[PDB]
Structure formats: C-alpha cells, structure tokens
C-alpha cells in the first residue's frame, strides 16, 4: 500500500530500528538494556509501531511494548501504547519536519500503580533514532528515566 | 523460550488464528470483516496479542489492535490493548479453563469520544476461537457490538 498523505512526513521513521539505551531514575540503580523499534504501516494515517528490550549480555527478552502513531498534517500527533507490564498511554504531541522531531506528553497513564505522566520526545540525529521517556509519580516531578539510540536496519 | 507457568494454562491461544466477524450497534448498519489474531510470547507471563481486520472482499486493510494478555494462577487475567482508531482499554476479569473461556470488562477505556466499556469474552468451541466484543456509551448501554469466529491456522 502507499503512504498515506498524513504519514508521510514520518516516512523517515518506517523500518526497523536496533541500538541500546540507558535507564535510571531515583531508587532504580542505572542500567542498560538492547532495544528493537519496528515502525510500519498498511496504507492508512496511522503507523503501528512495536518495540522490545532485552538483556545486553545474552538477548534474554525483558520487555514489550506496541502501539500506534497517528499524525495530522498541522503538526499535531496522538500516540497509542500498550506495554507488556501492564500498563497503557495516550500521549498527544506534535512534530517537526525540519527537526525530524516528535514530542509527546500522556493525557492518560492507565492501570500504573506509581506513573503518573510520561513524556515521550524522538529525535532523528544523524539518521539515528534517539529518544527520551521522562516520568512522573505523585513524589517525584517528571524527568528522566530512558534514554536510547537505534540504528536503521 | 519454555512457556511461562502462568501462561501454561491459556497455551491453547498460541499461534495464528483466521476467520470472519460481524458488527452491528445501534445507529451503525451491521456490516462484516475478516480478522487474524496473533497469540506469542517470549517466556515472560505475558501473551502478545496482535489483530488485523480487512474487508471481506477485497481484503483491504481496516483496522488494527495490538497489546497483552498477563494471566494469574488464581483465575485473574488483565488485559491492555492499543487500537489503531487511537483508544486504549485496560481490560480485567477471568479465565475458566474447563470452559476454555477468557471474560474481561474495562476498567478503563481512554481517548475515546463516544464510548464508555468494553467488554470481550473469549470462548474457544470446538477448537475455534470465538468473541463477542460488547460497547457502552453515555446513552447506549453494554450491548453486542462485534462477534468473530477464528479458525487456527
């Protein structure tokens, strides 16, 4: 199918995407972790996207993710996740072509016993992926929490 | 990777699965679909679910949803899934393994501008996988909006 009109500007993204990323957050020792994003589509205004991590010294699974990526041409996005620990988010944002940026912010956290927001921002940085998650709980305002960089497949 | 404990007992999703469905709901002419429905894990308590649906006579992509099943010992099971329309469920209930059933209603739907629950009851019969996806709103209550019946491929 061809790209829709609404997702072609975030034809950059559609592939698939293998690097390795960096937690930490306060009471959560830092660690690293391998990481795969699949962005891919079926000819309608919405990219379905699908990511896992796992372990860097064996590949042993750790967690999922999968959602979609609904762009408009005023710039504006909503992005839907549900993730393998149970939890779900909307997030709305926007983007920058020239940038070849997104930047996102949860309008809702479901079924999280702690979060409470989440930002989401990618960024395109030499034909890598890069992003930052942020989080937020009811005691600690939101800042970082995962960091990662991909390679395009 | 060996299927985990708390997976074993619904290991009869496991794998693809392929058939039609129909959808009707107040203000909304019944109408059908295909659908495939794809059941993985990676030997965490966590059943992948991925689905597609298209139109019957074409096989033109329609909608698409994706998300995890994270059953417990004690019968419990929650759900989340992320949907292509951009709306999120966080899906809880049980499971009954005589009956080869799976019944959740949402404690959360998100996004959405009109509807309020969602409930999905799995049912396999005769070895196919077989639903019904009933809908709420503000002014229709919980009633059948979609049922499917799925062979395994």
Redesign the interface.
């Known amino acids: ?1 061809p790209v829709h009109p609404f997702v072609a500007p975030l034809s950059y993204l559609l592939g698939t995407w293998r690097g390795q990323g960096e937690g930490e957050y306060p009471t959560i020792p830092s660690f690293r972790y391998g990481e795969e994003i699949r962005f891919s589509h ?3 205004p ?1 990219i ?1 996207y ?1 990511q ?1 991590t796992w372990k860097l010294e064996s590949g042993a ?1 750790a967690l ?1 993710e ?3 990526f ?1 762009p408009r041409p005023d710039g504006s996005i ?1 992005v ?5 620990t ?5 997030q709305k944002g926007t983007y920058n072509v020239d940038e070849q940026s997104i930047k996102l912010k949860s ?2 956290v ?2 999280a016993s702690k979060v409470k927001e989440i930002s989401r921002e990618f960024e395109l940085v030499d034909g890598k992926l890069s992003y930052v998650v942020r989080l937020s709980t009811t005691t600690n305002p939101l800042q970082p929490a995962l960091k990662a960089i991909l390679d395009k497949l």
């Open positions: 199918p079926s000819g309608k919405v379905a699908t896992k699974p999922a999968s959602g979609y609904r909503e839907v996740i549900a993730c393998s149970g939890l779900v988010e909307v309008d809702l479901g079924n």
